[PDB]
Amino acid sequence: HFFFTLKPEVVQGKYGFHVLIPGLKLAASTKKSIIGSLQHDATVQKILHEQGVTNPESCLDPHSASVPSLLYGSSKLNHKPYQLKTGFELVFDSSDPDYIPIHQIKNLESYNLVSELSLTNEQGSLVRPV
Amino acid sequence: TIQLTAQRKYLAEVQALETLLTRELSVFLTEPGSKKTNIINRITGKTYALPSTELLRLYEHLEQCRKQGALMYFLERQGTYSGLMLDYDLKLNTNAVPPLEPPALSRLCHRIFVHIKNSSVLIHFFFTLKPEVVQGKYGFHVLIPGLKLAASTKKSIIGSLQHDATVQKILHEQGVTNPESCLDPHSASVPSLLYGSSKLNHKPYQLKTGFELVFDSSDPDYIPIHQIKNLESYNLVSELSLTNEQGSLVRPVSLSILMLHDPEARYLHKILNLLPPEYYVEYPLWSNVVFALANTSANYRPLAEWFSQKCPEKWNTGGKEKLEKLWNDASHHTEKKITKRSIMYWAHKHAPQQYKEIVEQGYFSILAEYVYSYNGMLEHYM
């Protein structure tokens, strides 16, 4: 499951975005390696430029996975909580993940989003502990 | 038969369709064998060359009648430009429903996408299936009307998919005992049917799933299969039409004619099938029945011709030419007046107790027509 949440916008230097993927459990230096790989990734920068972003880099902080996160609806001090934008379900296969059904999820409101989106929650209904 | 009359009676949309065909679509007449036709109904074998406006109006009205639950038999023949029509007939060992899943359908989408990128390129996938519960299990039809590349390239793609085993591997994952011969070689070479059209003594195809996969010319490696169904909003008949480039959701990337003329000819054909063909074998009695049918009008010449093809060794070098000779003789004959009465007598003799239900069904339908037409107001002469 792929969940995209973002700020309510209308603030200097645009908003902030947080994709949340609590399906897997691989908290290690591999996360730092993935952060570094995305740091020099140019396809995401090109996509951001298509979205009119003047700051292709420095948006993804290198210490993303080394700091505590916020649950859904957890605003910052003197700020506003994040709101979900889209949710897409994409299954995976070990043999050949070439096929990619990113087909959009329907009726996310039926689930306890706070429980499902929690990293430490393995017993989530919508999500699974991969 | 009876169901068609019932639907014509208690459904107003059927009346609207009939009026539209008789008034607006009559002027768009098309020859029975000409390639200019795009919509053909096998119920009456009507052929039309409707422009875009008439096409879309017919699509909308077919959408309404299908949503009501009528019985359609329309067909369309692909032109030099059309989408992808695929006739996937599943022949399973067991007639048990296989629980197909959206991930498997998306995997099939990626497989066919890989199979088709090996040509010139620059999309909505529609998966409809039979209602199952039938011998040899059900069938499937993937419909891709987005593009327009109807040419020998389609034949090349069909040939490439014919020997594909990865699709067959998926079928065996679903427990299918017909990995080969499932895809007909004339997949895109036959006139298909618009969505909602049924088959003779077969329920119409119902849609299973809908997917969307945008083609990426810049990054063909990107295959984002993502879709939101919302299928009730779209005019499915118009959207799924191959010739309809202007769909909303999708983007434009002999004897048969005689039996159509006369149901009594259908009746005569049945009773002719009833009696044994031994009487046909010998010249005397076959000539007798030929004269008997020739007495009944002159347009039944092909009908006897139909009865002539049996035993071709007698038909050719003999039967074929002596049949027309006898017909020419009967064109002026007035000495003998054998009629259909003798044929019913012979049918009663040779195969008793079996033609009685045939005739019962015949006049049962005859009177049922009247009772449906006039709301049970029985009166003289009916």
Next chain:
Amino acid sequence: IAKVIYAMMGNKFVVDVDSNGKYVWFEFVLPGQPMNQGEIWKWRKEVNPDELHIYISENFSRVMDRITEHIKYHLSQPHESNILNYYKKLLKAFERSKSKIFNDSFKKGVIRQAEFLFRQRSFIQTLDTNPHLLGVGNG
């Protein structure tokens, strides 16, 4: 019904009164219809019109169905309440009255009424007046 029927076959039936006062019918034989030997392209006498009744029951039904579907089409279109109600009563009466064309007594009355329209004065006495016309087996 009689006016429409007179519009149907104005060229195929003639009604005339003989000396005895009984109306008699005459019809023009056309090729390809049930007939005796060799009366093609000629007028034949008749007492109780058969083909007339058959046409009353068979062909007239097509025009009746045309009227019915025209009413269907006008009812289908959106309009006000009053016009829809008026069309509903019109259709309700018309469908009840439509089945009457199969009744035997109604058909007999229609024929009796229509025999006045089909009359052509001075037709019996002008038969065969021209001596230069002869009726042969084939014309």
